[model samples]
Target: TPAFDKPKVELHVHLDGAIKPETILYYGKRRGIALPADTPEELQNIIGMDKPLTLPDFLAKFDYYMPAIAGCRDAIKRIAYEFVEMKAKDGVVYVEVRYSPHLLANSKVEPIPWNQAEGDLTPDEVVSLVNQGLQEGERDFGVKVRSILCCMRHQPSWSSEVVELCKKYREQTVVAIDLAGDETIEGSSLFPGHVQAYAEAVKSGVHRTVHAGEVGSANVVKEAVDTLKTERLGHGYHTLEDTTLYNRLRQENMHFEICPWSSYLTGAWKPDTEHAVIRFKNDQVNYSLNTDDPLIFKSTLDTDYQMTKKDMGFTEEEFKRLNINAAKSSFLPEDEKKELLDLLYKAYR
Candidate 1:
């Protein structure tokens, strides 16, 4: 039960959706912000389990944390710093943490140094503050961390401004740009302009990853590949449903970020019912296991490992494949990949 259950790598964690319940309580009291619950135990009811247990049901649980932070620099930076500590504790040697600057842009309580001249909830400041925290954590704890800026799909349109932020910080802080949100109902096809932004980002040299195939629609996965030119995919749990598309992604050398617990929670597929792990392993597709949103699901990166090993009846060799697959697909530059692989094999073996 130690945090470092296994040497690990993750690429699908969301900063906004992965706050610890105790963290919310801590920040809410300090910021004088009203939360859905007074204590962590009470807050669990709101995000813990859902009726209908659909994709929308999963998303609705996220809005509860927004008001808790009030988008203040201290709260944002603190969480960022603490997040890396948590990751390091969990034996995450390297991770790509994703979030939207715009989500923290607008809040009930105005964050300090508002720069009304620029606008409220200054997105730039939030970006810098978060980067500061993550960088410090990386240095202090020896956990390599990278941030990805996500432009939500259903929010009218993806933010060009978010793309610009990704470009500005793409050198070291921001490693990729993503289109994430309710992919079952919303997609890149609805917003052509968003695609253009993502395309420009691709040319900018940062990697591109998209949310696709979670809902089992090959068309969505195809469009993500064609429109965004996505190099990596998140939650393509159903990609194997269409053998052609599955082969296509594999042939193209694409890596799928698979989060099994979330898949079952969102009703994408069930561990008991045609769980994609069997397909993912048998097909030999490039893939990695991740904790998509740990807090919302009350899970951790290792939970997926346990699920695959125990409930799904996997072997030691397969866990090695999952971890090595993550090292291969990680956005970290080549040098870090070497170090990561060295550490992974050492601890894992």
Candidate 2:
């Protein structure tokens, strides 16, 4: 039996990180670039993780494949389309996919990503194209999908624009602004650009989430909470390292976007230690299960579900509870949020 054979909600997945190997291979060949592997299986083996790795090593997985997708409009759109199809198969009813728009753009963008020769795709246009693909995928796959535009931690110069994009594209599929990248870059959270962006988000009513404590300390989480004023925490596992901080967040009912397989494979959670999600469940903390990077982790939603069920003592009841919490905490607008809750209530009943 599948670990969680029910409709689920995901809030922390990276759009670029869940791409199909076949798609990556297609773009690599189409762009006349040499991929580490020509075949999909081999490519997957090269990109996917089979063992725990430090966060930096895990992040390096993107370098090998991103060149094939960046600077290619067709490939970017197709990747967005295929992401929804994959999530549909994983039994997710609603998912908030996130990615750095700057990373996908090859033109009118500062310091081009993936070492690509500059092309004509701008970061602003990247949002429009991804929106087109996501709306089409929603129609075809019958899964409600939204997106969060990410600000890379190292690229503080791009953070202000990321917030503006969130405001500009909020009417489309973009729902929130997120900080994603190497969290261990000490003091990166307090960078002025990020601070101003979050402040701008606050003034503009754009939602915010930050990647914190996954590879950093609990203080990083505090920065996200007190400084960035994020509505959610991405992989805040290390928050538990500080009991007072953990309890305060629980008291605030802050939503933790829990990614089980990501934490293990990224070395955010030690194998011998109990996962922080266990305590979340025990304390009735607000959280949602997710697959942060399915392709990189060599996993699907079920992989996380099964990890919690078989190893972490999660029950179907907890699954339903956390999903309902996820729906409540989602960055969806009020009307759509109500609709999603109605769907879940009907199904769970």
Candidate 3:
């Protein structure tokens, strides 16, 4: 087998959820926070594919790990740096790390109520800290990294604040805005205003992506596209349901960031190779690959590519095409995209 060292691009990753389990345990111990399980294996079992989870129960699992990261700038920086470094080792040339700044606020701290904290790191501070980490990661790893600030969909009317945060730090390192959290917890109509706010922000020259239809119905994909005007769809596996929407995505050249293993783990698809991704490839959908949460899913770009090859049986040509699709779909300008694509082709040859 080849080394699978082809240069790649990743557009979807959650910063807080991307921390390695060992790193999480270390930080948890330092902060005296009790994680869900003492050992990595136990932790995996708790959140792994074998476990069944409702949307609320699934979201609740993060409470045990949140305290370790709450209000810790250094920890945030370390995790960001580590994530990029690990991806670079796996041959990722560019990445966009996304997280909900509001979710990372004082409200995330469990056991101790949000009111107990004198003050939490503001969204601006969080973006600054994460950007600082991206700069450091680029310096150390020689990989391009950008940050996307996200707002939780479950928390209504916060997208305006998220847009404001993006506007405030747009020049810093935050390049895009996103909506995360459970998509199926409610219907997409509930988030139309929030999507409009992000779309408005994008019109002011901000890049945008939306979490759509991962665990939600096919209508969610339509809502994300028709309402949010997103440039990309995060975990858009459910686009398979509506042929018109799928054709529209193809016609518009819309990009879907598909996390194969994460999709299986989250029950979006069966733990089999013949899923929507394979179907997407067979039908020639415009899409790219990603690790939604490397730590949570125990995957990397290399792992995802290899799994697609071994399980989904993606051909070498398909793999190469996916790489090109990713670069083209990137938020980067045309010249930068050309540069990265040139580098990628040269490396592959």
lDDT of each: 0.76, 0.93, 0.76
Using all chains and alpha carbons, the TM-scores for the candidates as numbered come to 0.90, 0.98, 0.90
Worst 10 residues of 2 by lDDT: 51-60
Pairs in steric clash, model 2: none
> Which regions of candidate 1 deviate over 4 angstroms?
1-4, 50-56, 107-119
Task: Report the lDDT tens digits of candidate 2 across residue range 1-349.
Answer: 6798889999999999999999999889986977899999988999999888666677678999999998889988999999999999999999999999999999988788888897999999999999999999999999999999999999999999999999999969999999998888889999999999999999999999999999899999999999999999998999998999999999999999999988887778888987899989999999999999899988999999999999988999999999999999999999999999999999988
Count of residue pairs whose backbone atoms collide, per candidate:
0, 0, 0
Worst 10 residues of 3 by lDDT: 107-116
Q: RMSD for each model, in Å, please? A: 3.6, 0.9, 2.8
> Following a full C-alpha superposition, what root-mean-square deviation does model 3 have from the true structure?
2.8
Estimate the TM-score for candidate 2: 0.98
TM-score of 1: 0.90
Per-residue alpha-carbon lDDT of candidate 3 for residues 1-349, written as tens digits (9 for 90 to 100): 3325577788888887777777778888887777778887777556444444666676666765766776667777777788778878878888888887765555332323222263456656766777888889988998988788887776646777778877787756677888887787666435665866776776788887888878787788888888777889998888878888888898998988998877776777766446888888988877888888776666667777888888768887887888888888887756877998898788767
Off by over 4 Å in 2: none
Which residue runs does candidate 3 get wrong by more than 4 Å? 1-3, 39-52, 107-118, 189-193, 271-273
